[PDB]
From a paper:
PPARγ is a crucial regulator of glucose and lipid homeostasis and an important pharmacological target for treating metabolic diseases. PPARγ full agonists are strong insulin-sensitizing agents. However, over-activation of PPARγ can lead to serious side effects including weight gain and steatosis, for this reason PPARγ partial agonists are more desirable. In the present paper a series of previously purified and characterized saponins and sapogenins from Medicago species were tested for their ability to bind and activate PPARγ by SPR experiments and transactivation assay, respectively.
The MTT assay test and the transcriptional activity test performed on the most affine compounds (saponins 3, 6, 7, 8, 17, echinocystic acid 18 and caulophyllogenin 19) indicated that 17 and 19 did not show any cytotoxic activity at concentrations up to 100 μM concentration, but only caulophyllogenin 19 showed a partial agonist activity towards PPARγ. The final omit map showed clear electron density in the LBD of PPARγ where one molecule of 19 can be easily fitted. The ligand was accommodated between the helix3 and the β-sheet, where its carboxylic oxygens formed a hydrogen bond (2.1 Å) with the NH group of S342, belonging to the β-sheet, and the CO of L340 (3.3 Å), respectively. The 16α-hydroxy group is H-bound to the CO of G284 on helix 3 (2.7 Å). The 3β-hydroxy group made a H-bond with the hydroxyl group of the Y327 side-chain (2.9 Å). Moreover, there were extensive vdW interactions between the sulphur atom of C285, on the helix 3, and the carbon atoms of the rings C and E of the ligand. The ring E was also engaged in vdW interactions with the aromatic ring of F363, on helix 7. The position of 19 in the LBD of PPARγ was very similar to that of the partial agonist R enantiomer of LT175 (pdb 3D6D26) and also to that of the fatty acid 13-(S)-HODE (pdb 2VST27), a natural agonist of PPARγ. The X-ray structure of the complex PPARγ/19 showed an accommodation of the ligand in the LBD between helix3 and the β-sheet, typical of known partial agonists, where it formed H-bonds with the first strand of the β-sheet and with helix3. In fact, the X-ray structure of the complex PPARγ/19 showed that there could be additional space for the accommodation of the glycoside moieties in the region tipically occupied by full agonists, towards the helix 12.
Numbering used by the authors:
A (entry chain A): 207 to 262, 277 to 474
B (entry chain B): 207 to 258, 275 to 356, 358 to 473
């Protein structure tokens, strides 16, 4: 029944709101001209960066990004438990689903905080220029550019948070993940999520032909962001042996 | 209108049949569904191979020969896809150039099971195990088998694969495209036709459309990882003025 799919949509949307403090809706309200009830401070060069510390180098911008990632992971983890059936899966598979799904999700949601020109930071208080990031030294000025390229095409799908809630759930419950003990219960859950997403996209974007297929295709764009990111980390780990990574993040990488 | 989608679906199936000699229906018959009338010669070891200038290289090289054949058959097929020839010529070239690898692994799944791949005409069969028994070359075919095993579990037939292949060609995110709009316009139409096809041809296979699209992510990095050992091979085969005309064809 349609009815059951809508109810799952609603449930997932409700949990999404509860798990993620900075929604796409809030982020698009900050980025635009809109509703300057609170506009961001902007980082476009290094001494506006010094001014930034005051009302809100290549290393700490990275270490800072590392922080928002580990906190993002803990948030995605909270959301996953809300996915029906998820906590009932074998514990090893829960861990495995989180290991591989977490970065694909981080870059899906990061797009919400991005436009062509830059990215919101510190829960929206801040905004860091794409150009400033691209100008960073040696192995760091490279990190954010492919995320920006993805975000610009992903953002043109014009998804809202209730669409994203279901898409994110679909991503966590893959089944094609390396080392899954128990693939069939995982796929039963995903088929359910896919039915739900499909209905949601059709109802929320009736004029948008084949948005479902176009959104699913976007998943290969995510895969290769992760891939580039991972190998880039391996470089930095060698050029700066004094710089430390976060164990939680480290455990995620294999 | 469901009529035009169905019309499009039949068109591609017909075109697919004329462009590709060895169909999936045919290859399945020959394979382990055993059609036992003319058994294919089997290659399981070095001496059955010989019974078929350096073994491991020359297998990988024979692998290039048929892919070059495949490219031309795919090229012909693409030209039958409604709207394709009306596209900008550079865009047509671009679409084939970036799509042809994904199509090749896709169709190659049709010639594969968990134990090996139909070789040549289908008059041959090379065991998976003889293939992993190799140099740097032992890891060439294994990721294709792994993909094929999952892909084949979807139990698509030729009528399904016909539209799927068309969707792959008309992507729209290929680098260097000049006019993305008519390409996506066509792929949208192809995606609708594929959806209808799967619902009629597999009415009890839930969310098969989505799962098939999910496979495209598997194809792309299969391709991406393949180009990465495609050319550890230039770390291997290097200097000799014997193939420069042959070097050219590939
Ligand atoms: C044994 C040898 C030398 C001649 C016969 C045979 C065969 O299987 O029919 C053909 O040349 C086909 C390919 C190339 C062959 C083996 C695997 C390749 C292979 C699967 C090798 C991997 C390549 O990436 C692709 C997929 C082409 O991209 C090709 C497609 C064509 C076939 C099936 C065979 C090579």
């Amino acid at each position: 029944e349609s009815a059951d799919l809508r109810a799952l949509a609603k449930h997932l949307y409700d949990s999404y709101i509860k798990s993620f403090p900075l929604t796409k809706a809030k982020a698009r309200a900050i980025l635009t001209g809109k509703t300057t009830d609170k506009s961001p401070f902007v980082i476009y060069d290094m001494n506006s960066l010094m001014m930034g510390e005051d009302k809100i180098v290549a290393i700490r911008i990275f270490q800072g990004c590392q922080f928002r990632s580990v906190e993002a992971v803990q948030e995605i983890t909270e959301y996953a438990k809300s996915i029906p059936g998820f906590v009932n899966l074998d514990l090893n598979d829960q861990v495995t689903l989180l290991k591989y799904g977490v970065h694909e999700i981080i870059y899906t949601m990061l797009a919400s905080l991005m436009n062509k020109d830059g990215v919101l930071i510190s829960e929206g208080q801040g905004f860091m220029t794409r150009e400033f990031l691209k100008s960073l030294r040696k192995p760091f000025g490279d990190f954010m550019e492919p995320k920006f390229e993805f975000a610009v095409k992903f953002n043109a799908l014009e998804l809202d948070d209730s669409d994203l809630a279901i898409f994110i759930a679909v991503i966590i419950l893959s089944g094609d993940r390396p080392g899954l003990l128990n693939v069939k219960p995982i796929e039963d859950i995903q088929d359910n999520l896919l039915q739900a997403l499909e209905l949601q996209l059709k109802l929320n974007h009736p004029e948008s032909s084949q948005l479902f297929a176009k959104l699913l295709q976007k998943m290969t764009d995510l895969r290769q962001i992760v891939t580039e990111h991972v190998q880039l980390l391996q470089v930095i780990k060698k050029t700066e042996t004094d710089m430390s990574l976060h164990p939680l993040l480290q455990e995620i990488y294999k």
